[PDB]
Design a protein around this ligand. Structure first.
Ligand code: PNM
Length: 414
């Protein structure tokens, strides 16, 4: 079977990232041009390091008594190739934006869930497998989403008709909720302000009240309608994002969960805990009139004849919030970037909307998050980013990175 030629893995814009080369021996050596590009996505079949990506998720596609003879094991056959949805140019954009940081970025089409760029850092080359990096931080690492999760809280509060963007909230520096103390960043007392402004400035005190008003059943149900609990990806592996069993939640737990911090202590997992990919699916469903799409990364499969054997169809995971709700959420996210905590994602000449977040992790470090879309009117791309601080002060980086990736990718599209 080592005399059987495996198919190629190609990008949407025709860049071959994996291919088989017949050696004088007869056997084929798996080669990888542009080694280092989209490593986690392209993947590998390694005794030592395991399996990952397309090499393994499309393994069988890539892989008479003519069958006995090893000498004819090639004349008879060749494996079918896989054309990804990844666009090599957008992929380089994301990879360059991650240089010198650990974290990840996903760029997707909101109307279909097609993943156009997917990158994790640090990365590696296939050549190195011959000798942290291996974790795919887009899909197989979980993180506290922090305030990026407030997009869900907000969408739920509006969709259930429990609040509006102009409804005022008290946003004090600290407040006591269910026996515990919720606090705004730097205990900033913002006074009484509309929900749009609490969202823009990312007040934990205000969003925690929305959380408590919604209740645990509503917060979980809406998180799940956005994809939590699903192994996202029609043709790639994502670890499901997690929420607790609502019945086990406490009011304080619910308060922080509504701001993206998981503090639960119970049999079911603490939440929320998200993947970067799940964050993208939320941004996309909001940009997409509330319709959630199951992301995908294979466009089509080709026979060795350079012929189309199948094409992926975009598929919905359901409608998480109504169109009217999504339009209000989009307007709120535009405010974050225009006058709130996401001002760093602004790029002159383009209109960008999103939501930021920052979350403390182990050893006093923190992570920076950004989800968003562009252009504001008729969005054609969505971005999700995490920049892990790991000692460095990365406050605001997710948003700077997100806006720049969005703008560059839009130019690529033009
Ligand atoms: C949501 O992410 C909130 N984050 C925090 O309150 C905790 C935190 C942890 C480390 C450093 C700073 C804050 C609020 N939203 C973020 C954000 O939008 O990035 C703020 C930093 C604005 S506070």
């Amino acid at each position: 079977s080592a005399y059987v030629q495996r198919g190629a893995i190609i990008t949407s814009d025709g860049v071959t990232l994996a291919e088989s080369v017949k050696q004088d021996d007869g056997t084929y050596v798996r080669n990888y041009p542009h080694d280092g590009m989209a490593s986690h996505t392209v993947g590998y079949i390694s005794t030592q390091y395991g399996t990952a990506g397309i090499e393994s998720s499309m393994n069988e596609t890539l892989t008479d008594w003519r069958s006995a003879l090893y000498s004819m094991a090639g004349i008879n056959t060749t494996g079918s190739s896989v054309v990804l949805t990844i666009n090599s140019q957008m992929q380089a954009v994301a990879e360059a934006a991650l240089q010198g940081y650990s974290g990840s970025i996903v760029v997707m089409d909101p109307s279909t869930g097609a993943v156009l760029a997917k990158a994790s850092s640090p990365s590696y080359t296939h050549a190195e497998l011959g000798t942290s990096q291996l974790v795919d931080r887009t899909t197989q690492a979980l993180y506290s989403p922090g305030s990026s999760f407030k997009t869900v809280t907000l969408a739920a509060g509006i969709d259930t008709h429990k609040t509006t963007l102009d409804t005022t909230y008290s946003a004090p520096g600290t407040m006591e909720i269910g026996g515990g103390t919720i606090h705004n960043y730097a205990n900033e007392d913002m006074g009484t302000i509309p929900l749009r402004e609490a969202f823009a400035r990312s007040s934990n005190t205000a969003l925690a009240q929305l959380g408590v008003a919604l209740g645990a059943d509503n917060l979980v149900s809406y998180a799940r309608a956005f994809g939590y609990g699903t192994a996202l990806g029609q043709d790639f592996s994502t670890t499901p994002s997690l929420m607790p069993n609502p019945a086990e939640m406490t009011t304080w737990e619910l308060a922080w969960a509504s701001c993206g911090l998981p503090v639960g202590e119970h049999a079911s997992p603490a939440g929320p805990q998200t993947t970067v990919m799940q964050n993208a699916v939320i941004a996309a469903a909001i940009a997409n009139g509330g319709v959630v799409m199951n992301p995908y990364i294979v466009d089509r499969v080709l026979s060795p004849e350079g012929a189309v054997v199948s094409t992926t169809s975009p598929k919905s995971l359901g409608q998480a919030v109504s169109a009217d709700t999504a339009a209000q959420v989009r307007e709120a996210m535009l405010g974050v970037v225009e006058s709130g905590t996401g001002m760093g994602a602004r790029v002159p000449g383009v209109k960008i909307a999103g939501k930021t977040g920052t979350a403390d992790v182990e050893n006093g470090n923190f992570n920076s998050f950004f989800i968003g879309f562009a252009p504001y009117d008729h969005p054609t791309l969505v971005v999700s980013v995490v920049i892990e601080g790991n000692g460095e002060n990365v406050l605001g980086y997710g948003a700077q990175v997100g806006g720049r990736v969005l703008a560059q990718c839009l130019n690529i599209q033009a």
